[PDB]
Amino acid sequence: PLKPEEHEDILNKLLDPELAQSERTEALQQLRVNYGSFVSEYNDLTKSLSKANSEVAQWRTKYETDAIQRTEELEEAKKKLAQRLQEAEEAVEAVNAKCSSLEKTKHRLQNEIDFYFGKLRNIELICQENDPVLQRIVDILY
Amino acid sequence: MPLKPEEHEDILNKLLDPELAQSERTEALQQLRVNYGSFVSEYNDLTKSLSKANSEVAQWRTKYETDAIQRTEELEEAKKKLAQRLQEAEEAVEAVNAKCSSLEKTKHRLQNEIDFYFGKLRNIELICQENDPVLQRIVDIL
């Protein structure tokens, strides 16, 4: 397309009525061709604009739904590993309590042991210190 | 506002005549002038608008493209963090499970000891239940 100055010069040439008909026709044809090309380039610009704007909306919905969706995909992992974390951390304290139980069993039984061993020990001492039944009781031990 | 190619042509055709009055010739030429100005202004607005659209296209093309990377790794920020804690819990589980099994072994062992000593005692108690001076001392435990 002709820059305003170039176009202006042509108009100025056309102002002269005694300009040769050859040159006059040349200039007017120049103007028609230029106007045609200008319209063409203009429409090209319009459609080439719509092409970009369509991409504007395109991405205004493309990664706008992708934001929400990726958020969903995040909280997915969160919830899952939360269920795993909990189902683990419950078993933990479950068998922890069970262990703490077996400890009490251990101490109870050790008490019983020390007790009966105490009785046996007292009997043993009595035997070491001193008739019929005794030899038999000592035959129990040896 | 810019004239349709047909109107424009209708002006140029008038300008072809060398016997056109200078007033009318000047007027036609100024018509072309003004129309051309308005058309190139419209064109410029169009170009600038195109840049305004393309700037937004090039905006979203990169903007949430970095968001892709962003959330791609910061998702794994949570994926990696609790794949370690889940490990910690699931390992605590079988740690105390192991200890607890050991406590089962201990339980049975101790119970065996109890049965041993208690048994010996019952034997002695048989001997005592059957039958003299030492035996009164041994009975004095009961």
UniProtKB/Swiss-Prot annotation, chain A:
Top-rank lineage group of the source organism: Eukaryota
Signal sequence interval, chain numbering: none
Compartments it resides in: Cytoplasm, Myofibril; Cytoplasm, Myofibril, Sarcomere
Subunit note: Muscle myosin is a hexameric protein that consists of 2 heavy chain subunits (MHC), 2 alkali light chain subunits (MLC) and 2 regulatory light chain subunits (MLC-2). Interacts with ECPAS. Interacts (via C-terminus) with LRRC39.
Disorder cited: Cardiomyopathy, familial hypertrophic, 1: A hereditary heart disorder characterized by ventricular hypertrophy, which is usually asymmetric and often involves the interventricular septum. The symptoms include dyspnea, syncope, collapse, palpitations, and chest pain. They can be readily provoked by exercise. The disorder has inter- and intrafamilial variability ranging from benign to malignant forms with high risk of cardiac failure and sudden cardiac death. Congenital myopathy 7A, myosin storage, autosomal dominant: A skeletal muscle disorder characterized by prominent axial and proximal weakening, spinal stiffness, severe scoliosis, with or without respiratory and cardiac involvement. The age at symptom onset can range from early childhood to late adulthood, and disease severity ranges from asymptomatic to severe muscular weakness and respiratory insufficiency. Histopathological examination shows variable findings including subsarcolemmal hyaline bodies in type 1 fibers.
Comment, domains: The rodlike tail sequence is highly repetitive, showing cycles of a 28-residue repeat pattern composed of 4 heptapeptides, characteristic for alpha-helical coiled coils. Limited proteolysis of myosin heavy chain produces 1 light meromyosin (LMM) and 1 heavy meromyosin (HMM). HMM can be further cleaved into 2 globular subfragments (S1) and 1 rod-shaped subfragment (S2).
General function of this protein: Myosins are actin-based motor molecules with ATPase activity essential for muscle contraction. Forms regular bipolar thick filaments that, together with actin thin filaments, constitute the fundamental contractile unit of skeletal and cardiac muscle.
Miscellaneous field: The cardiac alpha isoform is a 'fast' ATPase myosin, while the beta isoform is a 'slow' ATPase.
Family assignment from sequence similarity: Belongs to the TRAFAC class myosin-kinesin ATPase superfamily. Myosin family.
Name of the protein: Myosin-7
Lineage: Eukaryota, Metazoa, Chordata, Craniata, Vertebrata
Location of this fragment in the whole protein: 1361 to 1425 of 1935
Swiss-Prot record, chain B:
Superkingdom in the source lineage: Eukaryota
Subcellular location: Cytoplasm, Myofibril; Cytoplasm, Myofibril, Sarcomere
Annotated family: Belongs to the TRAFAC class myosin-kinesin ATPase superfamily. Myosin family.
Subunit-level organization: Muscle myosin is a hexameric protein that consists of 2 heavy chain subunits (MHC), 2 alkali light chain subunits (MLC) and 2 regulatory light chain subunits (MLC-2). Interacts with ECPAS. Interacts (via C-terminus) with LRRC39.
Known role: Myosins are actin-based motor molecules with ATPase activity essential for muscle contraction. Forms regular bipolar thick filaments that, together with actin thin filaments, constitute the fundamental contractile unit of skeletal and cardiac muscle.
Extra information: The cardiac alpha isoform is a 'fast' ATPase myosin, while the beta isoform is a 'slow' ATPase.
Domain free text: The rodlike tail sequence is highly repetitive, showing cycles of a 28-residue repeat pattern composed of 4 heptapeptides, characteristic for alpha-helical coiled coils.
Implicated disorder: Cardiomyopathy, familial hypertrophic, 1: A hereditary heart disorder characterized by ventricular hypertrophy, which is usually asymmetric and often involves the interventricular septum. The symptoms include dyspnea, syncope, collapse, palpitations, and chest pain. They can be readily provoked by exercise. The disorder has inter- and intrafamilial variability ranging from benign to malignant forms with high risk of cardiac failure and sudden cardiac death.
Protein's name according to its UniProt entry: Myosin-7
Organism: Homo sapiens
Gene: MYH7
